[PDB]
Amino acid sequence: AIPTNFTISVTTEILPVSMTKTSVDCTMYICGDSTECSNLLLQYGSFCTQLNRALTGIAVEQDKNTQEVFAQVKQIYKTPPIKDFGGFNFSQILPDPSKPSKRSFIEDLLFNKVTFNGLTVLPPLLTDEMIAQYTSALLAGTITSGWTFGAGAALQIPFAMQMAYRFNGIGVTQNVLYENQKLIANQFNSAIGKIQDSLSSALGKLQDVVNQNAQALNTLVKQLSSNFGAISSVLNDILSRLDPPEAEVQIDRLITGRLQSLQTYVTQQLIRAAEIRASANLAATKMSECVLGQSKRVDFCGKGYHLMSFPQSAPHGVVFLHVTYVPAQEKNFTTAPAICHDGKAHFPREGVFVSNGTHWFVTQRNFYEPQIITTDNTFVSGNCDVVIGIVNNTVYDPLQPELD
Amino acid sequence: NTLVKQLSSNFGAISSVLNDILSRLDPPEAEVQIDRLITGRLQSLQTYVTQQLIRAAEIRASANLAATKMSECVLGQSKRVDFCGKGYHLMSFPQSAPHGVVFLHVTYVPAQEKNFTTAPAICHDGKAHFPREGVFVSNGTHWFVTQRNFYEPQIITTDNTFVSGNCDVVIGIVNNTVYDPLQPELD
Amino acid sequence: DVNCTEVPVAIWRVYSTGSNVFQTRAGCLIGAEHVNNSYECDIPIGAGICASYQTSQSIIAYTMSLGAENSVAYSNNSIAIPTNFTISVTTEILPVSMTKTSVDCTMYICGDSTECSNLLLQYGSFCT
Ligand SMILES: *[C@@H]1O[C@H](CO)[C@@H](O)[C@H](O)[C@H]1NC(C)=O
Ligand SMILES: *[C@@H]1O[C@H](CO)[C@@H](O)[C@H](O)[C@H]1NC(C)=O
Ligand SMILES: *[C@@H]1O[C@H](CO)[C@@H](O)[C@H](O)[C@H]1NC(C)=O
Numbered sequence: 005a006i007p008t009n010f011t012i013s014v015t016t017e018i019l020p021v022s023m024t025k026t027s028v029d030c031t032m033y034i035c036g037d038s039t040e041c042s043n044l045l046l047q048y049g050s051f052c053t054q055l056n057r058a059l060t061g062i063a064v065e066q067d068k069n070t071q072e073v074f075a076q077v078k079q080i081y082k083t084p085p086i087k088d089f090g091g092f093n094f095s096q097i098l099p100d101p102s103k104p105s106k107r108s109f110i111e112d113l114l115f116n117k118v119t120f121n122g123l124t125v126l127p128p129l130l131t132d133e134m135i136a137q138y139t140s141a142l143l144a145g146t147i148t149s150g151w152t153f154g155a156g157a158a159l160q161i162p163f164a165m166q167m168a169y170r171f172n173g174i175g176v177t178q179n180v181l182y183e184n185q186k187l188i189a190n191q192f193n194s195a196i197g198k199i200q201d202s203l204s205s206a207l208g209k210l211q212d213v214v215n216q217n218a219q220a221l222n223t224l225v226k227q228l229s230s231n232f233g234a235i236s237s238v239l240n241d242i243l244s245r246l247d248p249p250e251a252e253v254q255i256d257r258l259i260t261g262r263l264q265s266l267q268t269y270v271t272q273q274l275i276r277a278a279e280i281r282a283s284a285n286l287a288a289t290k291m292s293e294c295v296l297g298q299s300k301r302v303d304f305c306g307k308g309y310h311l312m313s314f315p316q317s318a319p320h321g322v323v324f325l326h327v328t329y330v331p332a333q334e335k336n337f338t339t340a341p342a343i344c345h346d347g348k349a350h351f352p353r354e355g356v357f358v359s360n361g362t363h364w365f366v367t368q369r370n371f372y373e374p375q376i377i378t379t380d381n382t383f384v385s386g387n388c389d390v391v392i393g394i395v396n397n398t399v400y401d402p403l404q405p406e407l408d
Numbered sequence: 409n410t411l412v413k414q415l416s417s418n419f420g421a422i423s424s425v426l427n428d429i430l431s432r433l434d435p436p437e438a439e440v441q442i443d444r445l446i447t448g449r450l451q452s453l454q455t456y457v458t459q460q461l462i463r464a465a466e467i468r469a470s471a472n473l474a475a476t477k478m479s480e481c482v483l484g485q486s487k488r489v490d491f492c493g494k495g496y497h498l499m500s501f502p503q504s505a506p507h508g509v510v511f512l513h514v515t516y517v518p519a520q521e522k523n524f525t526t527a528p529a530i531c532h533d534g535k536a537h538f539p540r541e542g543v544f545v546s547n548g549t550h551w552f553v554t555q556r557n558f559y560e561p562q563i564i565t566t567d568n569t570f571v572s573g574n575c576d577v578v579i580g581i582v583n584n585t586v587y588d589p590l591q592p593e594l595d
Numbered sequence: 596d597v598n599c600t601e602v603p604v605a606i607w608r609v610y611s612t613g614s615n616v617f618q619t620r621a622g623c624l625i626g627a628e629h630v631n632n633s634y635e636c637d638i639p640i641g642a643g644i645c646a647s648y649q650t651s652q653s654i655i656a657y658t659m660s661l662g663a664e665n666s667v668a669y670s671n672n673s674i675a676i677p678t679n680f681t682i683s684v685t686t687e688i689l690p691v692s693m694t695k696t697s698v699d700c701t702m703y704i705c706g707d708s709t710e711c712s713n714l715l716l717q718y719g720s721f722c723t
């Protein structure tokens with residue numbers, strides 16, 4: 005069976021990249037204003053230093069993630085002003101002048117769908133303005149320059165002409181693009197409409213990170229109130245109702261109990277950070293290959309044959325649009341491994357032999373385009389007798405009229 | 409270093425060094441004092457192991473990456489953009505380091521450039537001609553076909569191009585004459 | 596997380612007040628002067644601000660650039676073809692192992708006491 009039509013499809017993929025940078029002061033969490041709490045804590049020593057050497061390890065990693073997904077480029081490309089892209093209407097995904105932050109429409113439709121006792125929250129190094137600036141460069145690069153701006157200096161090429169190369173990479177001949185340019189553009193511009201619809205309806209991968217990294221802090225602050233088996237949870241009460249020579253044991257218990265909860269929370273941070281790192285690396289490799297190139301890697305860049313991708317920014321994460329080629333509407337055919345001619349066995353150079361029971365033809369593998377069999381489509385390498393399934397026929401010669 | 413310093417912490421025991429307690433106090437009082445140091449020391453030891461397990465778990469990912477990069481960059485060329493270094497990839501030479509490995513990647517980079525006019529196809533005897541591999545470029549007067557990555561022009565032969573359909577459908581096309589190299593010799 | 600109005604109340608000798616002070620979203624930055632130019636990020640501060648040491652030599656803090664800028668010459672009938680090339684060599688660094696540490700928990704906790712062992716067997720398997 006050989007397919008005879010196709011549909012361009014656009015598919016969506018969503019990835020987390022950073023959790024919120026946070027920090028805790030060991031002493032302001034464990035103690036109130038009590039000095040004796042501090043002086044008893046000084047009996048335990050170094051733990052209140054390691055807990056910051058731990059959390060600061062996470063805080064810098066959360067920069068180096070966002071730094072490394074996005075900064076593949078050092079040259080902010082302007083978009084051309086004239087939107088001549090041969091029928092493609094990217095106005096959904098480009099930035100626009102009027103918005104109070106220069107996020108695209110597809111980004112603003114997205115941004116909406118996502119929602120003290122020493123606890124401190126540190127801003128990120130990059131702002132959402134800087135992030136959205138970078139992605140506007142990756143769009144401008146890929147639309148005007150193909151892959152070349154990834155490999156080196158950016159070489160301009162017409163968009164409707166680069167699509168021919170992207171088709172050539174999947175074994176479809178360029179005539180199949182140029183004879184159909186109008187129809188293909190309509191399929192594309194239609195599919196972007198479904199993304200606006202579907203996005204308007206789904207961010208669970210992103211949304212639940214914001215949930216868990218709040219919920220753990222709520223657990224940590226609630227855990228202040230526990231008695232831990234002390235006589236009460238307020239240090240002033242301990243220090244007033246009982247003399248220090250014995251209130252010492254109550255304080256020592258309540259410090260030990262509280263400390264255990266911080267010593268757990270810091271590990272429940274680290275083990276998550278170690279998963280977000282694996283996600284940032286996967287997103288980095290997806291961007292390096294599927295956006296700045298074209299990749300043969302089956303189903304790595306979304307379902308189907310891959311053509312191109314566009315990145316779009318999101319809070320704490322990134323979203324891709326993968327544009328893919330899907331074959332459809334196929335017909336059955338008779339086939340044979342080889343043709344027998346004047347006693348000698350012909351094989352096709354690239355395509356495959358088919359017959360509609362009535363005539364014999366050769367056609368490329370992935371899009372029905374039958375042709376006359378010639379000694380220029382084929383090469384010869386033996387007698388007919390040796391290969392199974394050979395079929396007798398005749399090979400036309402364009403050099404035969406050239407007898408004159 | 410942190411783990412050795414933790415031996416000096418007293419955890420509310422009478423003294424840091426056990427031999428001080430275990431000399432100056434009798435068993436039934438020592439046995440309620442030494443009990444604290446053990447709990448303090450264990451918890452410092454427990455924390456250390458939980459740190460080593462995570463750093464091991466992350467180095468394992470780096471070693472597993474390097475083995476992927478060696479197989480796909482040294483024992484062969486690979487076309488994964490930016491995997492074997494920036495640019496187009498040619499070969500790589502490994503070198504060793506203390507606790508590590510260091511690659512040298514060898515990469516080709518296109519440099520000087522010039523602007524040209526170009527057209528999707530040639531319209532000939534009412535028949536369109538497409539290039540087999542290169543792209544058509546004009547220097548503003550003559551029309552050539554050239555490979556994509558390095559300017560090296562050639563005449564529009566009957567044998568670089570192939571034909572498919574009439575001139576009517578292709579949006580951008582320029583009328584131009586294709587050359588048949590057999591035409592003289594065939595006489 | 597301190598408004599610059601409040602900072603003097605805790606105080607280091609010069610920088611109590613009376614000095615260059617620069618409010619930022621990251622906080623109150625003092626002892627460095629703001630500049631309208633932009634550069635690459637020498638040292639990070641936060642929220643798009645980076646700091647550097649510069650020549651009169653002083654510390655300056657500035658909105659970091661994202662690098663340079665240029666347009667791309669795009670037409671619907673024009674193309675650019677490279678006419679020359681250069682080979683290049685680059686080094687990538689990967690860690691592969693760390694030290695094989697090993698620890699004897701009985702020696703560490705108890706030294707050479709026997710009694711400290713006789714206590715430790717209250718706790719069971721941990722030293723295994
Ligand atoms: C292929 O699909 C397109 C879009 O639905 C349609 O316009 C065209 O007529 C189809 N052609 C065939 C071979 O059915
Ligand atoms: C195809 O299979 C049938 C049934 O096994 C057999 O009779 C026939 O000879 C085969 N033909 C080819 C092309 O080998
Ligand atoms: C092709 O013709 C030859 C000679 O007549 C014959 O031996 C052979 O069986 C034929 N093969 C087929 C596939 O008809």
Ligand SMILES: *[C@@H]1O[C@H](CO)[C@@H](O)[C@H](O)[C@H]1NC(C)=O
Nearest residue numbers: 546547548549550551552561
């Ligand atoms: C184009 O190249 C040909 C090479 O033979 C040369 O004769 C011609 O003058 C060139 N034209 C322009 C405008 O550069």
Ligand SMILES: *[C@@H]1O[C@H](CO)[C@@H](O)[C@H](O)[C@H]1NC(C)=O
Nearest residue numbers: 531532575580581582583584
């Ligand atoms: C090519 O020639 C035909 C017939 O004269 C004409 O209609 C067409 O516009 C010409 N195209 C160009 C690009 O000169």
Ligand SMILES: *[C@@H]1O[C@H](CO)[C@@H](O)[C@H](O)[C@H]1NC(C)=O
Nearest residue numbers: 597598599600601618619622
């Ligand atoms: C600092 O305090 C002044 C006076 O109340 C106020 O006007 C200003 O907005 C405050 N700035 C910040 C960063 O809160």
Ligand SMILES: *[C@@H]1O[C@H](CO)[C@@H](O)[C@H](O)[C@H]1NC(C)=O
Nearest residue numbers: 088527579580581670671672
């Ligand atoms: C480019 O677009 C303009 C406006 O549609 C058109 O006049 C011109 O012929 C086009 N050029 C080519 C060769 O595509």
Ligand SMILES: *[C@@H]1O[C@H](CO)[C@@H](O)[C@H](O)[C@H]1NC(C)=O
Nearest residue numbers: 519520521678679680681682
């Ligand atoms: C290409 O670059 C090399 C090395 O710099 C130089 O020797 C040579 O002249 C250049 N050739 C061209 C065509 O620019």
